[PDB]
Amino acid sequence: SWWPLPLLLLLLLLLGPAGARAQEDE
Amino acid sequence: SMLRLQKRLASSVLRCGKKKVWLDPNETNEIANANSRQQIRKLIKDGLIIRKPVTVHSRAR
Amino acid sequence: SELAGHQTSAESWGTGRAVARIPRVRGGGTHRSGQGAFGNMCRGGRMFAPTK
Amino acid sequence: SSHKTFRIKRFLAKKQKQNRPIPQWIRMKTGNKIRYNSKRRHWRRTKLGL
Amino acid sequence: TKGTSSFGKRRNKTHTLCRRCGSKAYHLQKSTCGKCGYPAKRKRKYNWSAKAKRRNTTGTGRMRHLKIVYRRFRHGFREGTTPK
Amino acid sequence: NEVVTREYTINIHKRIHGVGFKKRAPRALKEIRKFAMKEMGTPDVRIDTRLNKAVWAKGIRNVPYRIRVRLSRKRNEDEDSPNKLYTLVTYVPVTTFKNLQTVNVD
Amino acid sequence: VRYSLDPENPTKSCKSRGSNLRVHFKNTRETAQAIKGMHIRKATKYLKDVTLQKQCVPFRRYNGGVGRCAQAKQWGWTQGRWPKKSAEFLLHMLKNAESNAELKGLDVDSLVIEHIQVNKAPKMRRRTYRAHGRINPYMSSPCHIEMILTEKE
RNA sequence: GUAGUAGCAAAUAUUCAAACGAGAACUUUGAAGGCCGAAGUGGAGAAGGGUUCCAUGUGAACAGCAGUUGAACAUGGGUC
Ligand SMILES: O=C(c1ccc(-n2nnc3cccnc32)cc1)N(c1ncccc1Cl)[C@@H]1CCCNC1
Ligand SMILES: [Mg+2]
Ligand SMILES: [Mg+2]
Ligand SMILES: [Mg+2]
Ligand SMILES: [Mg+2]
Ligand SMILES: [Mg+2]
Ligand SMILES: [Mg+2]
Ligand SMILES: [Mg+2]
Ligand SMILES: [Mg+2]
Ligand SMILES: [Mg+2]
Ligand SMILES: [Mg+2]
Ligand SMILES: [Mg+2]
Ligand SMILES: [Mg+2]
Ligand SMILES: [Mg+2]
Ligand SMILES: [Mg+2]
Ligand SMILES: [Mg+2]
Ligand SMILES: [Mg+2]
Ligand SMILES: [Mg+2]
Ligand SMILES: [Mg+2]
Ligand SMILES: [Zn+2]
Numbered sequence: 001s002w003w004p005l006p007l008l009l010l011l012l013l014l015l016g017p018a019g020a021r022a023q024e025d026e
Numbered sequence: 027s028m029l030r031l032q033k034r035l036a037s038s039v040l041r042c043g044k045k046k047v048w049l050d051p052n053e054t055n056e057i058a059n060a061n062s063r064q065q066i067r068k069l070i071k072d073g074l075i076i077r078k079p080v081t082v083h084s085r086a087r
Numbered sequence: 088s089e090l091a092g093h094q095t096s097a098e099s100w101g102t103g104r105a106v107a108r109i110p111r112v113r114g115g116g117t118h119r120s121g122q123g124a125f126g127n128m129c130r131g132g133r134m135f136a137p138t139k
Numbered sequence: 140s141s142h143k144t145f146r147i148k149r150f151l152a153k154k155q156k157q158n159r160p161i162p163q164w165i166r167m168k169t170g171n172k173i174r175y176n177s178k179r180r181h182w183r184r185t186k187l188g189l
Numbered sequence: 190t191k192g193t194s195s196f197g198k199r200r201n202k203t204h205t206l207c208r209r210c211g212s213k214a215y216h217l218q219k220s221t222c223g224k225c226g227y228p229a230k231r232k233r234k235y236n237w238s239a240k241a242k243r244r245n246t247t248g249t250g251r252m253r254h255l256k257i258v259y260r261r262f263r264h265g266f267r268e269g270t271t272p273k
Numbered sequence: 274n275e276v277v278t279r280e281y282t283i284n285i286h287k288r289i290h291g292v293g294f295k296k297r298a299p300r301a302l303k304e305i306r307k308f309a310m311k312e313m314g315t316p317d318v319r320i321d322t323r324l325n326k327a328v329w330a331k332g333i334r335n336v337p338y339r340i341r342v343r344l345s346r347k348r349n350e351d352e353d354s355p356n357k358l359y360t361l362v363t364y365v366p367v368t369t370f371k372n373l374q375t376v377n378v379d
Numbered sequence: 380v381r382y383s384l385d386p387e388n389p390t391k392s393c394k395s396r397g398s399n400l401r402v403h404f405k406n407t408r409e410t411a412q413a414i415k416g417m418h419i420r421k422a423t424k425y426l427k428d429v430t431l432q433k434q435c436v437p438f439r440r441y442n443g444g445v446g447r448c449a450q451a452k453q454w455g456w457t458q459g460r461w462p463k464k465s466a467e468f469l470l471h472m473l474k475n476a477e478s479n480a481e482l483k484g485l486d487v488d489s490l491v492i493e494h495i496q497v498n499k500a501p502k503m504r505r506r507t508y509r510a511h512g513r514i515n516p517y518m519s520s521p522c523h524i525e526m527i528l529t530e531k532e
Numbered sequence: 533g534u535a536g537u538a539g540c541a542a543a544u545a546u547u548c549a550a551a552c553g554a555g556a557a558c559u560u561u562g563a564a565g566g567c568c569g570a571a572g573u574g575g576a577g578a579a580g581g582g583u584u585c586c587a588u589g590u591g592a593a594c595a596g597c598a599g600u601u602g603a604a605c606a607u608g609g610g611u612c
Contacts, residue, residue, distance in 0.1 A: 003179070006184075006505075015511045016511065027553080028552090028600095033561090051560095052550090146206065160605090182603090183603075187582085189213045295544065322549055322563060330564075330565085401592095444535075
């Protein structure tokens with residue numbers, strides 16, 4: 001009888017980019 | 027068949043901790059009949075729940 | 088249409104994420120946040136040369 | 140916050156009013172398509188935060 | 190520790206419920222309101238956020254008195270009672 | 274049908290060998306259930322709390338090397354188990370384990 | 380309702396069905412093929428042994444990463460596993476199918492299992508927490524069960 | 533498709549029996565074996581959370597296994 005629970009909105013957030021920067025070729 | 031109420035309630039009545047206050051699993055329904063401090067104070071003074079005296083830490087050594 | 092083909096406000100992420108360069112709405116929580124904003128090819132975008 | 144002012148207790152009074160389920164006779168009316176309370180709020184997940 | 194383990198330090202509230210618009214925006218450490226400008230005389234609205242005018246101009250409340258001025262204008266503000 | 278009662282010594286020092294310290298003494302009781310199951314045929318084994326106290330009375334990593342137990346086979350009723358029979362293992366004390374052997378005792 | 384392969388001697392065949400039951404689909408498929416065609420005396424007796432881990436269920440189509448076992452030599456195969464909860468619910472339907480065989484008035488020990496279908500249900504969704512504050516879904520896979528039981532004439 | 537795969541591995545730990553129960557590795561009691569060891573895994577508050585407190589009832593959700601349990605759901609109470 002009760003309405004189904006959860007299924008709330010996400011809200012993706014920023015994450016680290018380009019893995020381990022490390023050292024660029026030069 | 028759920029004595030967690032009577033678990034806590036004797037500890038406030040005996041004025042001692044929860045880890046000790048016990049005897050008689052055999053009279054299970056006799057304890058679970060009761061639900062109040064009035065009820066449980068009868069049950070202390072006739073012998074279903076005892077103090078279980080303190081563990082020993084002798085200084086004789 | 089005349090107005091409010093795009094009432095919304097958005098800028099685009101750009102490069103460092105794998106999505107695309109359509110503008111994406113700004114915010115979070117409400118699950119339209121992050122979706123495709125105005126333009127032709129999006130849900131809730133304006134039309135192409137909104138009729139006058 | 141366990142000791143507080145009166146404006147908050149009026150605000151918090153109304154949020155417990157809101158926070159109760161749907162009776163089973165409004166659900167069986169005519170002119171109805173409500174199934175539940177969507178404005179239902181649970182205090183672990185969604186704070187009201189004033 | 191720039192992020193998570195210094196979000197645990199968030200403890201005191203700056204914005205608080207105000208009394209004219211009531212939207213948890215009343216900066217206690219200045220005593221002003223960011224939404225409608227409480228100690229000022231005038232209701233804060235600007236022309237760069239059209240939706241904010243749309244959120245709080247007339248029509249969205251009740252107009253619980255301003256409606257029946259429109260009702261009385263349909264007869265030109267009568268002051269008698271009725272015939273029997 | 275059979276209601277026999279025997280008495281056993283069980284060399285726990287070999288039935289525990291290499292079971293680690295924090296796991297040692299539970300396998301003592303897993304093995305007695307494996308011991309009591311095999312010796313009587315029946316699967317259902319209930320051991321006494323007196324038997325539990327005797328095993329555990331020197332910690333979980335120092336089990337006594339041999340335990341003179343008593344194997345009794347009984348039977349269950351009253352909207353019963355699908356089994357007819359079961360076991361009630363009980364702890365009989367003896368000081369030293371020389372010259373003793375598995376003697377069927379009524 | 381409607382079944383795949385509605386039977387060919389329909390008064391002389393009883394049927395049972397299950398929908399929206401919380402188990403794993405890929406486990407329930409392989410145990411259905413072990414069942415299929417076995418007599419209902421042996422269908423009772425086989426699925427007690429899977430819960431007792433004495434006799435396996437071979438994994439024929441959904442085989443990825445299942446370890447080998449000893450008991451797939453009854454099946455001409457290598458990889459077997461011993462699913463409890465597939466066997467728990469699939470032993471359930473056979474007693475429900477026994478129950479319908481009682482009411483119609485059959486000879487319930489001539490009953491072989493003619494047809495048994497297991498197909499995926501609308502899957503229920505939960506969420507768990509991976510690294511960097513990224514949600515990834517975490518969902519069930521329930522399955523619908525049908526069966527037809529036909530007398531060996 | 534990957535896939536019944538990674539994975540459910542931080543901080544020493546469970547055991548035996550008994551009751552209710554369709555149903556017990558986890559719920560309750562009882563005994564043993566334990567650890568926190570007074571800068572506590574203890575007793576109480578300020579901030580913030582706002583009914584979470586208590587009781588009873590169910591077991592479709594949810595609790596990343598399970599549950600006969602709960603800070604879940606349902607009903608009713610309590611803050612002088
Ligand atoms: O955790 C990470 C970390 C490592 C790799 C990634 N990347 N890079 N590209 C990626 C694509 C997919 C997934 N991950 C990715 C992200 C983070 N660390 C880290 N290490 C080295 C440089 C920068 C950082 Cl932040 C911390 C630092 C301190 C010691 N503990 C670990
Ligand atoms: Mg605009
Ligand atoms: Mg549009
Ligand atoms: Mg809030
Ligand atoms: Mg730091
Ligand atoms: Mg003024
Ligand atoms: Mg493997
Ligand atoms: Mg995780
Ligand atoms: Mg986080
Ligand atoms: Mg695995
Ligand atoms: Mg692996
Ligand atoms: Mg019992
Ligand atoms: Mg029972
Ligand atoms: Mg220590
Ligand atoms: Mg502390
Ligand atoms: Mg509580
Ligand atoms: Mg109940
Ligand atoms: Mg669970
Ligand atoms: Mg509630
Ligand atoms: Zn204001």
